[PDB]
């Protein structure tokens, strides 16, 4: 088997292969995540001849935890499958289900081991993992190709994620949090910054307290498009 | 292009050389050893108010009598922190006792040059860990603070810092440090020396402090406890 | 099973019965126990029927590989060595008792090969449950350098003594003469034993509950 | 002679389809500074090469390129001496292992094929070089009579009526193709003297006993006979009239 | 430039530059001295501090009751190669119930450290040892290197500015065999501070001593432990 | 040549493996070691250059005992030479285990030479920077002496030299009629040749290592005792004048 | 060793995989392979690059491969790499069938091969498989399905798509003429021949078509014969000429 | 060893070592194969450099089992690896299935092996295109397999030096229900286009496959076909 050192330090102390993996994230579709009290939400950027279902970038990992990603879609699918395996394997070892921190720590640990083990280039993805814990607290974390992880109130990754995070930093108030409708509107506003003409080109899903994941179809999405643009005038 | 286990003409490994260069990019951390306790302080370096401040654990509990502060590649550190945590409880299992601060630091120091290409196991390392660790605890030989770098070199320190302003902070530690001082003087010394080098102006959400005394266990400071110390 | 072998002047003759028994019940009446190895090398199968089947299959393939590579007609010493070293590694658990007979560069050759991996080069031999009857016939009337006609007659008489005498053995005598110029496989060379019946049931005597008919368009 | 990539450094194809690393192994045969010749008679087969002893401090018995592989088979090597010994050790192993597995004396074509198939692995795999040496086997086949068989660093092999290898290969094969076209009663005397005169007239040296070494197998004595300096002396003085 | 990166690559000069580069790890590493009498073997080490606040670097390590070492190079290779010696000693005490001969232990280091100099994608041990020990053949000082070569010694020094130490030792060779313990330690200390400049000299913080002989097991002396030995001669 | 000289898995266009040739240069730069086959045995002599007077006598021992009945004398990179001695020790030990008697020297030379040859075929390893001479005496086989080089060639020798003064030592050996002379005589003449070929101007002072194997030692490779070495060192100095 | 390493499994400075991209350029030269979904079926239509007078025609296809009873696929790229991948697809289909005793769902079989193709981009130091596949099938969950994949180990579900020579030109032509939800297999067969008329340089030896359909509770995979193709070519020539006059 | 591909994609998108291996085939001693109605022919140039070479010793046209045969253009040593492997693959089919291996299935198995060396670690591909004759379901079979590991079933084709001339020569002059008498004669005429010298029984080699399996033709059998040319 192949024992070559793939990821190594440079003259100036950079892990170039991890840095090039983060360039592969910045080309991928703009994924955005937002937290609330009762609800947690994810949304993604977007051809006429495709099945939307197959190229879905929002994926459930267990009954309580799901995730979004941005970057290389093949690399994403392996991390998602191995996350899904670890979620059930966690229940098999200690009965109680997975907290959002534990699965994020695992995905981070998996990403980090590919930046340091021989033969293997890093995973060219950043993820946005969301859900509800044992006690029922809502969570949103973010991993990246290096295998660092941090909790967030809201965050963006992908194309123009600076301009989305700049928008989120301002707009994330206590007013937008309180209701289920208002948190969803905030995600669509944020995606409308980067999405050149929104509506139809926005994937979007939600998670509530005890309930499982729920993707909103383009009919449900275009309802909230009307509720945003009317309120701007007033 | 060359191998990971290649010496320079100066007589040192390029990847170890470049692992020391990686710590300069990392955010600064200070630890001061005193007779009354070892304090440990670190800047979080928060890039956004959306980012939750409490989920940047740059000081962590190794055991009830030991802590460890880190600078550099944050992901690389978590492998070494877990191995230390495993080592202490493996020692508790076998020997029914606590490890020394030296013994823990040595165990982590054994992993530093465990990298290479040919002749290796499935999960074995390609490169070194680009992480400096400031261990700090209280064992049978009083309160002890220990430094470690990517080479594996580890040594006891009366006071030391690591990171971007390691050079700048060590000059401030030389003047400020006195060997017969108290713990509370040493705590406030660190936050003075941290406030200068950051220039985000220092606050309870922007930093982590933590201490270990002989009587008291490892304690990481809260918002209220940090807000009391903040500035005098 | 009664299998036997015999070296004569111009070649070698190999004999075998046709009964295959499952415990103390006759499963097969007509089966070939004389197996092909090479053009002028054949082998008799005794002991465990699967182990006798698959080893002779395997060595035949090895001799085809060996002959194709060498560009030569294979030696009878080579089949014996391959069998031995296969059979020896398995410590007799591959239970193939075999009589290996043929002609090559160095003349007519007959080898007894036992399942543990021992061997014996011989002028006559016998193996299987009725070996003793056949081997008694050979000891009584064998001489050096037999004729083609006398060897067939003796070897038929040997395998027949097993067929009648041994409960395991039965049916017809298969045989295989291996002269210098090729090998004559005399299948059903003899028939010691030689029915009535006719139990015509009327259609509708068997009662039927379900019926489905699948016609075959594909 | 077009080139791209690492095609001259490792055994991979050039643009023309050649393997330059294989071609360099043929050049490495000439570095030894010696030429071998091998000839096939009616009832025998013989091999001859330079027993070059410049230093008097060498033990001249231990200086040899002729090697015994089995009783009935022996070979002359030519090329790099370390590679040459190594290839001989493997020929002895494969020959013995054949007699263990298959129960008879390995034929000369199959031993030469076996070593040639081993040489191909070096010709295809990048991790090792080819062996810079050339094995010429001789031995008495039972059906086919006497046999002479060369094999290359490339992994070629072939049976020959006569052959040569080393520095003056092309001159030796040019001399042998002239003499083979003429009719001769190819006896032991005829076959041996053709080999010595071919190596003599190509190099342009009147040899002494110590300047050559001779290996042979006859129909009567098929065991591999390496002739002594006294036995060599008789064949040289037999050519006193020429 | 072409023959610099891999240990397997012979230079056209007939040299392996990755060995010779690994030798420079010892030289830029701190100074240490070793010497022996008829009855004892002593190691003396100039402990290099990182900053003046930080405590001094541990340069003399324990191997067995009858062997100990002083180091110069990469500390991870020092500790790895120390544990190899500790283990081979432990094997000999387990198997034979008898301490391992020092020359035999030193031969196993040479055998071990040579292995990676001949193999691709591997490197020599970036560390030189001075090995003090007593056995059935009396006291010994042995040296080892990154090149896998080892040397039996009357005395030796290695590290930064260690030419100064070697010149001192080569004068006082016949003196060492006749010396008592205190005179033998004092000789090793004078060799060490010759490596230093005229501005700075030996203190209890920056010096460590390691002693073994017929009477004594391999004891290490660091701080107040050292104070008896220094207080004798101190000028220049 | 340049480009083609980095790996032992790479020929040059001339048909040469430069990595093997560069390993032989490390022997040519190393100090002179010699050995001669007598009538009643074999003797070894070595120019051991003292790098420092700080080192003990019998340090950097370039003479080794491979077996009780066999002696090895080395020249080149010494770390590689010691590992070759460990290979030859085990290889000789394997023969005694397999066949129940003392290994023949030609066989021991061949089996260790193929070990040396294996390292001249691959990028994964490098050649041994070391030539060595194996020497032995027996009842039946008698006196035998073989030399091996980095490439892995094994030849038998009446006399042999390797190191700095490879050619210079050999022309001095050609003068001696070794075939008639004995081991008792040859120790003087071996010690003489080292003192001649030693460059006092260029190199530092040296210690002469002397070992032997013969009828004197009952076919056992021992060191030459201090009685006979110092007699031969005295003979070397006075006959130089 | 380190000098001789191509390093196939690394990110280039831009943030992308060179051997993956360079393998997709190999596909861009290879033959025009397309697929079209319908209400009553699924089809694959491919350019037949093995075209000579002296070719034998042993097999029922050339680029089309059956995988399961309810599934099939066609390829574009290096045909030897396709023989490895198709063999492995067949192995996966039976490995599922042995385990669950149902046919493998179409998306699951495609993800299983695409997880393997992605491995050759991430680790092992090996060059990727230089093949894009178009898959067709039926299962109990989603019914009539069409999938595309490529050397990266990335897949997508399509209503209609193309790979090979004039890939982009064929997809934009399919984006005009395809009507979602309204297409039958007869109308889809017309569009397949329309697109191949644009891309290729149109005899029936150069074309190779197959149709997956569901008739009477069992899937029916069949290659079209050269009588069926040639009559569909003349129907295009007449329908093309009939519009040209008016 | 080396655990990485030596064959890799260039910016154009071509596996360069395979096209370089095809150059080794294209510059090899030429070889021809023809499928009659009642049989299959395989013929090739066996013109060695001197009369010193023993012609009976080594063969280009080689059997695999009693019903399949083989011939090549390009690298001779590489060819011998594929012969030994194909021979094993035939027996591995016969052991399992107790039936003579289909010719299509033998080609597919050897193709998979030829593909293996265009990807696996530290190995170049083979510098050989194979021609594989056979007889399965009462009818003839002829297949090419080239360094890529791709295979094509041919009625007739040529390889090596002047393969373009041999292929066009065959295209017009081949009929799809030839007699095996005529096809053997055609195969020798295809070789005589590309030949440099007077042809003989020694300097070319021919094998045939029909109802009673595959065999190599004797020199005297070839000499009869050379008499009427
Ligand atoms: Na019976
Ligand atoms: Na090679």
In this structure, are residues E151 and E164 in contact, taking their beta carbons and an 8 Å threshold?
no
The full DSSP string for G118-153 is HHHHHBSSPPPP-EEEEEEE--TTT-SEEEEEETTT
Here the CATH number for the domain that contains residue H168 is: 3.60.20.10
The answer to whether the CB atoms of C81 and D103 lie below 8 A apart is yes
**Cβ distance of G158 and A50 shorter than 8 Å:** yes
Chain D residue with CA closest to F150: the answer is: D82
Q: How many CA atoms within 13 Å lie on the side-chain side of B68?
A: 24
- Give CA–CA dist C36/C19, Å, rounded: 19
The domains of chain C, with CATH numbers, are 1-218 (3.60.20.10)
Compute φ and ψ for F235, nearest 5 degrees.
-60, -40
User: Taking Cα atoms as reference points, which of F206, F235, F190 lies closest to residue F43?
Assistant: F190
End-to-end Cα spacing for chain E? 44
G100 lies within 8 A of chain D by CB: no
Report CB contact under 8 Å: C58, H64. no
Q: Where are the beta strands (DSSP E) in chain B?
A: 29-33, 38-43, 59-63, 66-72, 131-139, 142-148, 154-156, 159-162, 207-212, 219-220
User: Which distant-in-sequence residues (6+ apart) come within 8 Å of A124 by Cβ?
Assistant: A21, A24, A25, A71, A72, A75, A145, G11, G15
Instruction: Report the domain count for chain F.
Output: 1
Q: Give burial (CB, 10 Å; 0-12/13-18/19+) of F112.
A: buried
Interface residues on A facing G, Cβ-Cβ cutoff 8 A: 1-2, 4, 6, 17, 20-27, 47-51, 53-55, 72-75, 77-78, 81, 114, 119-124
Q: Does D119 touch chain H (CB under 8 A)?
A: yes
**Residue numbers of the domain that contains B154:** 1-232
Choose among D30, D128, D130: nearest Cβ to F122: D128
* Cα F117 to averaged position of ligand 1 atoms, centre (Å): 66
SS (H, E, C) G153-187: CEEEEECEEEECCCHHHHHHHHHHHCCCCCCCHHH
* Domain span holding position H109: 1-229
Cβ contacts from D onto F, under 8 A: 100
Positive or negative: CA dihedral G121, G124, G129, G133 = negative
A226: phi > 0 → left, psi -120 to 50 → alpha, else beta; which?
alpha
Could C105 and D107 be called an inter-chain contact, meaning their C-beta atoms sit closer than 8 Å?
Answer: no
Distance between CA atoms of residues E130 and E156, nearest Å:
8
d(CA C164, ligand 1 centre) in Å: 4
- Taking the CA of residue A142 and the nearest CA in chain B, the distance in Å comes to 10
Q: Which residues of A touch B49 (CB under 8 A)?
A: 169
Question: What is the separation of C-alpha A82 from the centre of its chain, rounded to a whole number of angstroms?
Answer: 16
Minimal Cβ distance to H20: which of D15, D163, D176: D15
Q: How far is the CA of H80 from the centre of ligand 2 (A)?
A: 17
Ligand with minimal distance to D125 CA: 2
CB contact residues (below 8 A), chain E span 106-125, against chain B: 119-123
Catalytic sites of C, residue numbers: 1
Please tell me the total count of domains within chain H: 1
C20 Cα–ligand 1 center, Å? 11
**F156/D28 touch (CB, cutoff 8 Å), yes or no:** no
Query: Any idea what DSSP says for residue E31?
Result: P
Query: CB distance from G140 to chain B under 8 Å?
Result: no
Q: How far apart are CA F190 and CA F41, in angstroms?
A: 13
Q: How is residue B71 written in tokens? A: 């600078």
CB neighbour list of residue G245: distance below 8 Å, 6 or more residues apart = none
What resolution in angstroms, rounded to 1 decimal? 2.8
Provide, as residue numbers in chain H, all residues whose Cβ is less than 8 Å from the Cβ of C61: 91, 94-95
Give, for B182, the enclosing helix (H) or strand (E). none
Q: Based on the structure, what is the number of domains in chain B?
A: 1
Determine the 3-state secondary structure of A151 from DSSP.
strand
> E strand or H helix at B7, and its extent?
none
The domain A1-234: what is its CATH number?
3.60.20.10
Determine the Cα–Cα distance for residues C99 and C17; give it in Å rounded to an integer: 13
Using an 8 Å Cβ cutoff, are B184 and B205 in contact? no
Q: Name residues with Cβ closer than 5 Å to ligand 2, which is an ion.
A: D 11, 122
Q: Which residues, in sequence order, are CB contacts of A155 under 8 Å at separation 6+?
A: A32, A33, A128, A140, A142, A165, A168, B50, B51
CB count within 10 Å of CB E2 equals 12
B126 contacts: CB under 8 Å, gap ≥ 6: A4, A5, A6, A7, A8, A116, A117, A118, B4, B115, B116, B117
| CB-based contact F79:E110 (threshold 8 Å) | yes
Per DSSP bridges, beta strands A31-34 and A39-45 are antiparallel
Put simply, the answer to whether A4 touches H4 (Cβ < 8 Å) is yes
Residue G1: list chain F partners with CB under 8 A.
123-124
CA distance E26 to E127: 6
Spans of all domains in chain G: 1-246
Chain B residue nearest residue A171, CA to CA: B50
Cα B198 vs. chain centroid, distance in angstroms? 18
Range of the domain at F12: 1-241
CATH number of the domain to which F86 belongs: 3.60.20.10
Is there a contact between B3 and E5 (Cβ–Cβ < 8 Å)? yes
CA distance G80 to G131: 9
* Pairwise CA distance, residues E147 & E5, whole Å: 16
Number of domains, chain D? 1
Distance between CA atoms of residues G161 and G20, nearest Å:
20
CB-based contact, G2 to chain D, within 8 Å:
no
Q: What tokens appear for F198 in the block? A: 């030693």
- What's phi and psi for H91, nearest 5 deg? -65, -45
Q: Say whether residue G3 is in contact with chain B using an 8 A CB cutoff.
A: yes
For chain A, state the CA radius of gyration: 18
D10 CA from centroid of ligand 2 (Å)? 6
Experimental method: X-ray
Q: How far is C-alpha G165 from the chain's CA centre?
A: 13
* The pair of three-digit structure tokens given for residue C168, joined into one six-digit string: 């395991």
- Tell me if D142 and C82 make a contact (CB, 8 A cut-off): no
Edge-first strand order for the sheet with D44-50 is D162-166, D35-40, D44-50, D212-218, D225-227
Q: How far is E51 from chain F (nearest CA, A)?
A: 34
Contacts of residue H135, Cβ cutoff 8 Å, sequence gap at least 6? H39, H40, H67, H68, H103, H141, H209, H210, H211, H213, H214
Cα of H143 to nearest chain G Cα, Å? 9
Of D117, D127, D180, the CB nearest to H52: D180
Burial class (CB in 10 A: 0-12, 13-18, 19+), H11: exposed
CA–CA separation, E208 and E188 (whole Å): 11
- Chain C residue numbers with beta carbons less than 8 Å from the beta carbon of H95 are 57-58, 61
Q: Residue B148's beta-bridge partner residues?
A: B133, B154
Taking CA–CA distances from G3, the nearest residue in chain B reads B1
Closest to A126 (Cα-Cα) out of A234, A8, A25 = A25
Q: Which two tokens stand for residue G244?
A: 């040209």
* Rounded-to-10 torsion of CA H187, H193, H197, H199: 20
Question: Closest to B126 (Cβ–Cβ): which among A112, A117, A155?
Answer: A117
Determine contact, residues H35/H204, Cβ cutoff 8 Å.
no
Topology classification of domain G1-246: 3.60.20
CB G210 within 8 A of CB G46: no
How far off is chain A from B79, nearest CA to CA, in Å?
8
CATH code (residue E66): 3.60.20.10
Tell me the sheet residues that pair with A139: A131
Nearest to C103 by CA among C12, C189, C14, C17: C12
Residue from B151, B116, B146, B125 nearest B20 by CA: B151
Contact D91, F116 (CB under 8 A): no
Q: Is E113 on the interface with F (CB under 8 A)?
A: yes
Residues of H with CB under 8 A from a CB of A: 3-4, 121
Instruction: Report the alpha-carbon distance of residue F169 to residue F187 in Å, rounded.
Output: 15
User: How far does G185 lie from chain H, in Å, by closest CA?
Assistant: 31
Q: How many residues in total does chain E contain?
A: 236
Q: What are phi and psi of B178, to 5 degrees?
A: -135, 135
Tell if the CB–CB gap between E10 and F59 is shorter than 8 Å: no
**CA distances from residue B78 to A118, B68, B108, E22 in whole angstroms, order as listed:** 19, 11, 12, 31
* Cα separation, D66 vs D82, whole angstroms: 14
Instruction: For residue F69, give the DSSP letter.
Output: T
Task: State the DSSP H helix or E strand holding residue C79, giving kind and residue range, or none if neither.
Answer: helix C76-89
Tokens of D47: 């091999």
Q: Is residue B85 within 8 Å of residue B99, measured between CB atoms?
A: no
Between CA H172 and CA H182 the distance in angstroms is 15
Which of G7, G115, G175 is facing A78, going by the closest CB pair?
A: G115
Distance in angstroms (rounded) separating the CA atoms of residues H187 and H131: 13
């Amino acid at each position: 088997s192949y024992d070559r050192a793939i990821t190594v330090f440079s003259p100036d102390g950079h892990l170039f292969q991890v840095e090039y993996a983060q360039e592969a994230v910045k080309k991928g579709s703009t994924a955005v995540g937002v937290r609330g009290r009762d609800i947690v939400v994810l949304g993604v950027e977007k051809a006429k001849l495709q099945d939307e279902r197959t190229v879905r970038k929002i994926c459930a990992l267990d009954d309580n935890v799901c995730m979004a990603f941005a970057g290389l879609t093949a690399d994403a699918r392996i991390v998602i499958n191995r996350a899904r395996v670890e979620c059930q394997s966690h229940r098999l070892t200690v009965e109680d289900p997975v907290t959002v921190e534990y699965i994020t720590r695992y995905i981070a640990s998996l990403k980090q081991r590919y930046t340091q083990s021989n033969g293997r280039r890093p995973f060219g993805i950043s993820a946005l993992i969301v859900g509800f814990d044992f006690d029922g607290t809502p969570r949103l974390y973010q991993t990246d190709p290096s295998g660092t992880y941090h909790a967030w109130k809201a965050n963006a990754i992908g194309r123009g994620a600076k301009s989305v995070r700049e928008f989120l930093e301002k707009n994330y108030t206590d007013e937008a949090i309180e209701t289920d409708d208002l948190t969803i509107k905030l995600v669509i506003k944020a995606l409308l910054e980067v999405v050149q003409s929104g509506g139809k080109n926005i994937e979007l899903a939600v998670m509530r307290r005890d309930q499982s994941l729920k993707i909103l179809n383009p009919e449900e999405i275009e309802k909230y498009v009307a509720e945003i643009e009317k309120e701007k005038e007033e | 292009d060359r191998g990971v286990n290649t010496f320079s003409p100066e007589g040192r490994l390029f990847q170890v050389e470049y692992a020391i260069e990686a710590i300069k990019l990392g955010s600064t951390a200070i630890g001061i050893q005193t007779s009354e306790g070892v304090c440990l302080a670190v800047e979080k370096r928060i890039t956004s108010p959306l980012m939750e401040p409490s989920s940047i654990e740059k000081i962590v509990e190794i055991d009830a009598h030991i802590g460890c502060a880190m600078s550099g590649l944050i992901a690389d550190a978590k492998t070494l922190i877990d191995k230390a945590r495993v080592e202490t409880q493996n020692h508790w299992f076998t020997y029914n006792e606590t490890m020394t601060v030296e013994s823990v630091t040595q165990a982590v120091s054994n992993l530093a040059l465990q990298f290479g290409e040919e002749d290796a196991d499935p999960g074995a390392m390609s490169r070194p860990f680009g992480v400096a660790l400031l261990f700090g605890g209280v064992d049978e030989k009083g309160p002890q603070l220990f430094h470690m770098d990517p080479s594996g070199t580890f040594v006891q320190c009366d006071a030391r810092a690591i990171g971007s302003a390691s050079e700048g902070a060590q000059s401030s530690l030389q003047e400020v440090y006195h060997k017969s001082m108290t713990l509370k003087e040493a705590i406030k010394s660190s936050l003075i020396i941290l406030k200068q080098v950051m220039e985000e102006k220092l606050n309870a959400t922007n930093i982590e402090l933590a201490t270990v005394q002989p009587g008291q266990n490892f304690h990481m400071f809260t918002k209220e406890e940090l807000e009391e110390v903040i500035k005098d | 099973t009664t299998i036997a072998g015999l070296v004569f002047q111009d070649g070698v003759i190999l004999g075998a019965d046709t009964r295959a028994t499952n415990d103390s019940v006759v499963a097969d009446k007509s089966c070939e126990k004389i197996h092909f190895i090479a053009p002028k090398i054949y082998c008799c199968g005794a002991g465990v029927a699967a182990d006798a089947e698959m080893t002779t299959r395997m060595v035949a393939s090895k001799m085809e590989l060996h002959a194709l590579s060498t560009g030569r007609e294979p030696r009878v010493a080579t089949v014996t060595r391959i069998l031995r070293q296969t059979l020896f590694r398995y410590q007799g658990h591959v239970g193939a008792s075999l009589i290996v007979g043929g002609v090559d560069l160095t003349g007519p050759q007959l080898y007894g090969v036992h399942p543990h991996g021992s061997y014996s080069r011989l002028p006559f031999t016998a193996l299987g449950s009725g070996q003793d009857a056949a081997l008694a016939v050979l000891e009584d009337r064998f001489q050096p350098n037999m004729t083609l006609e006398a060897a067939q007659g003796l070897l038929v008489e040997a395998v027949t003594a097993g067929i009648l005498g041994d409960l395991g053995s039965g049916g017809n005598v298969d045989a295989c003469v291996i002269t210098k110029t090729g090998a004559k496989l005399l299948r059903t060379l003899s028939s010691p034993t030689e029915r009535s019946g006719r139990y015509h049931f009327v259609p509708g005597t068997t009662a039927v509950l379900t019926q489905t008919v699948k016609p075959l368009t594909l | 002679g077009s080139s791209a990539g690492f095609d001259r450094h490792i055994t991979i194809f050039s643009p023309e389809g050649r393997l330059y690393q294989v071609e360099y192994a043929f050049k490495a045969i000439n570095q030894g500074g010696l030429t071998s010749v091998a000839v096939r008679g009616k009832d025998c087969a013989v091999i001859v090469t330079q027993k070059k002893v410049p230093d008097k401090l060498l033990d001249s018995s231990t200086v040899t390129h002729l090697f015994k592989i089995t009783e009935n088979i022996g070979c002359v090597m030519t090329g790099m001496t370390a590679d040459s010994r190594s290839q001989v050790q493997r020929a002895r192993y494969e020959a013995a292992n054949w007699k263990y597995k298959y129960g008879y004396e390995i034929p000369v074509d199959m031993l030469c094929k076996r070593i040639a198939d081993i040489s191909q692995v070096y010709t295809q795999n990048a991790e090792m070089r080819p062996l810079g040496c050339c094995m010429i086997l001789i031995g008495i086949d039972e059906e086919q009579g006497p046999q002479v068989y060369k094999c290359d660093p490339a992994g070629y092999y072939c049976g020959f009526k006569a052959t040569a290898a080393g520095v003056k290969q092309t001159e030796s094969t040019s001399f042998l193709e002239k003499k083979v076209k003429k009719k001769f009663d190819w006896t032991f005397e005829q076959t041996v003297e053709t080999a010595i005169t071919c190596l003599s007239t190509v190099l342009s040296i009147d040899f002494k006993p110590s300047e050559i070494e001779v290996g042979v197998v006859t129909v009567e004595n098929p065991k591999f006979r390496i002739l002594t300096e006294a036995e060599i002396d008789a064949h040289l003085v037999a050519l006193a009239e020429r | 430039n072409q023959y610099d990166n891999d240990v397997t690559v012979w230079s056209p000069q007939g040299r392996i530059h990755q060995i010779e580069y690994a030798m420079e790890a010892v030289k830029q590493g701190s100074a240490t001295v070793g010497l022996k009498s008829k009855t004892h073997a002593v190691l003396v080490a100039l402990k290099r501090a990182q900053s003046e606040l930080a405590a001094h670097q541990k340069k003399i390590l324990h191997v067995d009751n009858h062997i100990g070492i002083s180091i110069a190079g990469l500390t991870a290779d020092a500790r790895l190669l120390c544990n190899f010696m500790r283990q081979e000693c432990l094997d000999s005490r387990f198997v034979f119930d008898r301490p391992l001969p020092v020359s035999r232990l030193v031969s196993l280091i040479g055998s071990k450290t040579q292995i990676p100099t001949q193999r691709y994608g591997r490197r020599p041990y970036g560390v030189g040892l001075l090995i003090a020990g007593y056995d059935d053949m009396g006291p010994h000082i042995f040296q080892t290197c990154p090149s896998a070569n080892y040397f039996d010694c009357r005395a030796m020094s290695i590290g930064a500015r260690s030419q100064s130490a070697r010149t001192y030792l080569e004068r006082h060779m016949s003196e060492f065999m006749e010396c008592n313990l205190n005179e033998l330690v004092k000789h090793g200390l004078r060799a060490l501070r010759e490596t230093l400049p005229a501005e700075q000299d030996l203190t209890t913080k920056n010096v460590s001593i390691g002693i073994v002989g017929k009477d004594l097991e391999f004891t290490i002396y660091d701080d107040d432990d050292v104070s008896p030995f220094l207080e004798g001669l101190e000028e220049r | 040549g340049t480009g083609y000289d980095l790996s032992a898995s790479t020929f040059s266009p001339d048909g040469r493996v430069f990595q093997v040739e560069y390993a032989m240069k490390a022997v040519e730069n190393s100090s002179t070691a010699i050995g001669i086959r007598c009538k009643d045995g074999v003797v070894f002599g070595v120019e051991k250059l003292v790098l420092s007077k700080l080192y003990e006598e019998g340090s950097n021992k370039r003479l080794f005992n491979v077996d009780r009945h066999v002696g090895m004398a080395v020249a080149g990179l010494l770390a590689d030479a010691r590992s070759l001695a460990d290979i030859a020790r085990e290889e000789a030990s394997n023969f005694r285990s397999n066949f129940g008697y003392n290994i023949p020297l030609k066989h021991l030379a061949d089996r260790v030479a193929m070990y040396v040859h294996a390292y001249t075929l691959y990028s994964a390893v490098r050649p041994f920077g070391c030539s060595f001479m194996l020497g032995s005496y027996s009842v039946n086989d008698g006196a035998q002496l073989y030399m091996i080089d980095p490439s892995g060639v094994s030849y038998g020798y009446w006399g042999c030299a390797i190191g700095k003064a490879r050619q210079a030592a050999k022309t001095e050996i050609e003068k001696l009629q070794m075939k008639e002379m004995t081991c008792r005589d040859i120790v003087k003449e071996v010690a003489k040749i080292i003192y001649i070929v030693h460059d006092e101007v260029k190199d530092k002072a040296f210690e002469l290592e002397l070992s032997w194997v013969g009828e004197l030692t009952n076919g056992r490779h021992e060191i030459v005792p201090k009685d006979i070495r110092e007699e031969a060192e005295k003979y070397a100095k006075e006959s130089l004048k | 060793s380190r000098r001789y390493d191509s390093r196939t499994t690394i990110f280039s400075p831009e943030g992308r995989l060179y051997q993956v991209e360079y393998a997709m350029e190999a596909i861009g030269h290879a033959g025009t392979c397309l697929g079209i979904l319908a209400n009553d079926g699924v089809l694959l239509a491919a350019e037949r690059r093995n075209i000579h007078k002296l070719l034998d025609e042993v097999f029922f296809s050339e680029k089309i491969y059956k995988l399961n009873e309810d599934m099939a696929c066609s390829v574009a790229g290096i045909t030897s790499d396709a023989n490895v991948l198709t063999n492995e697809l067949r192995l996966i289909a039976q490995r599922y069938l042995l385990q669950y005793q149902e046919p493998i769902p179409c998306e699951q079989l495609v993800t299983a091969l695409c997880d393997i193709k992605q491995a050759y981009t991430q680790f092992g130091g090996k060059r990727p498989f230089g093949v894009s596949l178009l898959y067709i099938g039926w299962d109990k969950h989603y019914g009539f399905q069409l999938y595309q994949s490529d050397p990266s180990g990335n897949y997508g579900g399509w209503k209609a798509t193309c790979i090979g020579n004039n890939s982009a030109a064929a997809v934009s032509m399919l984006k005009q003429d395809y009507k979602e939800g309204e297409m039958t297999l007869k109308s889809a067969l017309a569009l397949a021949i329309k697109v191949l008329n644009k891309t290729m340089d149109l005899s029936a030896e150069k074309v190779e078509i197959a149709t997956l359909t569901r008739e009477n509770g069992k899937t029916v995979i069949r290659v079209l014969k050269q009588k069926e193709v040639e009559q569909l070519i003349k129907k295009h020539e007449e329908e093309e000429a009939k519009a040209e006059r008016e | 060893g080396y655990s990485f591909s030596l064959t890799t994609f260039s910016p154009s998108g071509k596996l360069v070592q395979i096209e370089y291996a095809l150059a080794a085939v294209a510059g090899g001693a030429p070889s021809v194969g023809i499928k009659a109605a009642n049989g299959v022919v395989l013929a090739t140039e066996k013109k060695q450099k001197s009369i010193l070479y023993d012609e009976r010793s080594v063969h280009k046209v080689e059997p695999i089992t009693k019903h399949i045969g083989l011939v090549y253009s390009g690298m001779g040593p590489d060819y011998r690896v594929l012969v030994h492997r194909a021979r094993k693959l035939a027996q591995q089919y016969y052991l399992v299935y107790q039936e003579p291996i289909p010719t299509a299935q033998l080609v597919q198995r050897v193709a998979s092996v030829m593909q293996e060396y265009t990807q696996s670690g530290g190995v170049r591909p083979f510098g050989v295109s194979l021609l594989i004759c056979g007889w399965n379901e009462g009818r003839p079979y002829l297949f090419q397999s080239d360094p890529s590991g791709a295979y094509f079933a041919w009625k007739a084709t040529a390889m090596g030096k002047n393969y373009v001339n041999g292929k066009t020569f065959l295209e017009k002059r081949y009929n799809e229900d030839l007699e095996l008498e005529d096809a053997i004669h055609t195969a020798i005429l295809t070789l005589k286009e590309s030949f440099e010298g007077q042809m003989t029984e020694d300097n070319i080699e021919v094998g045939i496959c029909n109802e009673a399996g595959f065999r190599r033709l004797t020199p005297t059998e070839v000499k009869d076909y050379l008499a009427a040319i």
